[PDB]
């Protein structure tokens, strides 16, 4: 059926959207690591000042 094929394409689009949504979660996880690095960098900078003192 032609309509059923279009529904399968919609399911593929939903799967693509689901993959994109999963990729967004992976992208958020990648951005989460960068955010943690910035927090660690501030602590490292404070520790470096203590070492200099």
């Amino acid at each position: 059926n032609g309509i059923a094929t279009l529904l399968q394409a919609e399911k593929e689009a939903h799967e693509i959207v689901s993959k994109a949504r999963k990729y967004r979660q992976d992208k958020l996880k990648q951005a989460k690591t960068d955010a943690a690095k910035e927090i660690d960098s501030y602590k490292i900078q404070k520790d470096k000042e203590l070492k200099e003192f």
């Binding site: 059923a4 094929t5 399968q8 399911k11």
Partner: protein, 236 residues
């Protein structure tokens, strides 16, 4: 009748030699089924005895691949139920009765080692399905779900190929073809409901497209089977 009896006698004489019997076994796989049908239809004691002797010679231990030939006959031509029916029926001839009893014993021995999985495999290889009891048996499907998905879902791929062939043959829309298509659709629905990993393989192999095409079939039973398969796929 005389010509048929002479032909049966000649066939039995040829099958007396194990090499010739083995050669003729592979010459016509449906020869045993035709002989059994003729024996059942014919009421002559001599003709029935000749047919029984010819059938036994094909499955005789002297002929090559005797066990394989007996198993193939019992799987395709339904040798075991035919022999059971013949044993139940009363035959006036003593020699014919003894031959029928020996054939029934051989068929029972062959079927003892065989299982429903072998029958399903033979039916899939022959591409003939008429709503077998294993198809409607929930326990058989539950116990054979792993077997179907085994070998990278080889059985599932074979079923998908059979469904595609039936869809290509759906233009004829024969009664036997419609029954085979319905049985294949039911098997696909069962293999999708249980162990849904085969659903992705079927979709990649065009099983969903075949089901959608069958949903527009003129036959009411085929359309209902395709609708049920679609509902089991993504429907509620």
């Amino acid at each position: 009748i005389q010509l048929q009896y002479h032909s049966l006698l000649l066939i039995w004489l040829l099958t007396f030699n194990p090499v010739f019997a083995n050669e003729l076994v592979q010459k016509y796989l449906s020869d045993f089924l035709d002989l059994l049908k003729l024996v059942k239809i014919t009421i002559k004691e001599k003709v029935s005895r000749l047919c029984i002797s010819i059938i036994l010679q094909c499955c005789s231990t002297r002929v090559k691949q005797h066990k394989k030939v007996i198993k193939q006959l019992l799987l395709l031509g339904n040798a075991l139920p035919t022999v059971q029916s013949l044993s139940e029926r009363k035959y006036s001839d003593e020699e014919l009765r003894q031959d029928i009893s020996n054939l029934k014993e051989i068929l029972e021995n062959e079927y003892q080692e065989l299982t429903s999985f072998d029958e399903y495999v033979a039916e899939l290889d022959s591409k003939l399905l008429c709503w077998s009891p294993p198809h409607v048996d929930n326990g058989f499907w539950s116990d054979n779900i792993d077997e179907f998905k085994k070998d990278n879902y080889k059985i599932f791929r074979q079923l998908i190929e059979l469904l595609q062939a039936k869809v290509r043959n759906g233009d004829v829309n024969a009664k036997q073809e419609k029954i085979i298509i319905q049985v294949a659709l039911n098997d696909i629905t069962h293999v999708v409901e249980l162990l849904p990993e085969s659903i992705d393989v079927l979709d990649k192999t065009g099983g969903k497209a075949d089901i959608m095409e069958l949903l527009n079939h003129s036959d009411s039973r085929v359309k209902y089977e395709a609708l049920k398969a679609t509902q089991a796929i993504i429907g509620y």
